[PDB]
Amino acid sequence: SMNKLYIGNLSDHAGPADLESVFKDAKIPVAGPFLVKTGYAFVDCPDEGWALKAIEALSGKMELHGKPMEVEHSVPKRQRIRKLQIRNIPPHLQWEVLDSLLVQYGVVESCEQVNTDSETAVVNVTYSSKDQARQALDKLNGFQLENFTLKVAYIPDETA
RNA sequence: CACA
């Protein structure tokens, strides 16, 4: 499931209490403890919708000890293969236009809308190959359209 | 992005 979070760009004295207070103030419940390492941490949310809420609310936006936090789906290294999630999609972007961007980097095996509270849309995309998804991640992340900047990240590819 |  996609309820696991990676928390990146942490300060050298950020501790579980700091992170606990960040997630409390944004009213994100968590299902377990914060595991804080050197410069990064992990936490579980109760389900997928809360995890996405935390990403959309905190990642690139919340500053802790004067550093912007990265909050992203935790993805094991070896499971960064065909699958990506695209965030910050313009609310009225026709799917055909989105598709015309995706296919510039490979064959789309599936593109699923992820229902969300935000104004912006979210899709999960499976390319046919690791190389295609890498290219799409590199070229779509940061792309500006209709006054929004796409955010693209890996999600676990557990079957490739 | 976790591994003595």
From Swiss-Prot:
Sequence ranges assigned to domain RRM in this UniProt record:
3-76, 82-157
Where is it made, tissue-wise?
Expressed in oocytes, spermatogonia and spermatocytes (at protein level).
Q: List the disulfide bonds.
A: none
Record's subcellular location: Nucleus; Cytoplasm; Cytoplasm, P-body; Cytoplasm, Stress granule
Record text about domains: All KH domains contribute binding to target mRNA. Domains KH3 and KH4 are the major RNA-binding modules, although KH1 and KH2 also contribute. The KH domains are also required for RNA-dependent homo- and heterooligomerization. The integrity of KH domains seems not to be required for localization to stress granules.
Entry function: RNA-binding factor that may recruit target transcripts to cytoplasmic protein-RNA complexes (mRNPs). This transcript 'caging' into mRNPs allows mRNA transport and transient storage. It also modulates the rate and location at which target transcripts encounter the translational apparatus and shields them from endonuclease attacks or microRNA-mediated degradation. Preferentially binds to N6-methyladenosine (m6A)-containing mRNAs and increases their stability. Binds to the 3'-UTR of CD44 mRNA and stabilizes it, hence promotes cell adhesion and invadopodia formation.
* Record's subunit section: Can form homooligomers and heterooligomers with IGF2BP1 and IGF2BP3 in an RNA-dependent manner. Interacts with IGF2BP1. Interacts with ELAVL1, DHX9, HNRNPU, MATR3 and PABPC1.
Family of the protein in this entry: Belongs to the RRM IMP/VICKZ family.
The protein, known as? Insulin-like growth factor 2 mRNA-binding protein 3
Name the species this protein comes from: Mus musculus (Mouse)
User: Which start and end residues of the full protein are shown?
Assistant: 1 to 159 of 579
